[PDB]
Design a protein around this ligand. Structure first.
Ligand SMILES: O=c1cc(CP(=O)(O)O)c2c(Br)cc(Br)cc2[nH]1
Ligand SMILES: [Zn+2]
Ligand SMILES: [Zn+2]
Ligand SMILES: [Zn+2]
Ligand SMILES: [Zn+2]
Length: 233
């Protein structure tokens, strides 16, 4: 149905959106600099358990996310993966850890999170140190496409449902301007996007880090936005 928008989600609340069977996205809202922003994560069913991808951007949001998951799906979230080190992906890891969730991130993400003073996922994800690396983690595949939105960003693919979760390295179609690119690699971002396209050409649903899902067109759109911002246009 109608994908949850930022104007339909109260402060501190979380909505779930079933993309395919056993694949949900969780949508929360955060406000800063006078504007309010939506944010996406992923929930993938893993037998009788659930694998969570990224927090709900904040401790209060994440606590509500776990409560919503508990009320809606009613299956235990045993593992969680943060796709990069910024607050919208690791903010709430301490809440997850306190509830017994095992938190995971690449060694690059954990290091950059500690330097930033953010919350630090406990477990380290091996085998994702070089561009193009891919490892299977439960019911999903983790992919390091190279530096883009950040040097450590990962993308997540669900081969059971052909769902690609790009994180903040992928923009929604309505977004035509780059955001917090302070830690981005504008020079490598388009090349990293092409690695995603080359590795997941069969993806049917593409989930951006923020906003409405779509198809693989979101990849070229992100490349166009990054190239436009590169030339200061
Ligand atoms: O500074 C920012 C940070 C974000 C969060 P992000 O960098 O993780 O995408 C942001 C977003 Br979502 C949308 C817009 Br319009 C502007 C933004 N400005
Ligand atoms: Zn970020
Ligand atoms: Zn553990
Ligand atoms: Zn983001
Ligand atoms: Zn476009």
């Amino acid at each position: 149905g109608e994908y949850p928008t930022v104007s339909e989600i109260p402060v501190g609340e979380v909505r779930l959106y079933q993309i395919a069977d056993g694949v949900w996205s969780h949508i929360a809202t955060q406000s800063f600099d006078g504007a309010v922003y939506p944010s996406n994560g992923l929930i993938v069913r893993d037998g009788d358990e659930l694998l969570l991808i990224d927090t709900a951007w904040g401790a209060k949001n994440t606590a509500a996310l776990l409560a919503e998951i508990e009320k809606q799906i009613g299956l235990p979230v045993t593992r969680a993966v943060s796709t990069h080190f910024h607050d919208d992906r690791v903010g709430g890891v301490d809440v997850l850890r306190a509830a017994g969730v095992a938190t995971y991130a690449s060694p690059s993400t954990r290091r950059l999170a500690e330097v930033e003073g953010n919350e630090i996922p406990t477990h380290s994800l091996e085998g994702l140190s070089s561009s193009g690396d891919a490892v299977r983690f439960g019911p999903v595949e983790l992919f390091y496409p190279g530096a883009a939105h950040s040097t450590d960003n990962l993308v997540v693919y669900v081969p059971s449902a052909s769902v690609l979760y790009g994180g903040c390295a992928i923009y929604e179609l309505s977004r035509t301007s780059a955001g917090n690119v302070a830690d981005a690699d504008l020079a490598e971002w388009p090349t990293s996007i092409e690695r995603i396209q080359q590795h997941y050409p069969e993806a049917q649903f593409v989930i951006p880090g923020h906003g409405l899902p779509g198809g693989l067109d979101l990849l070229k759109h992100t490349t166009n936005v990054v190239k436009a911002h590169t030339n200061r246009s």
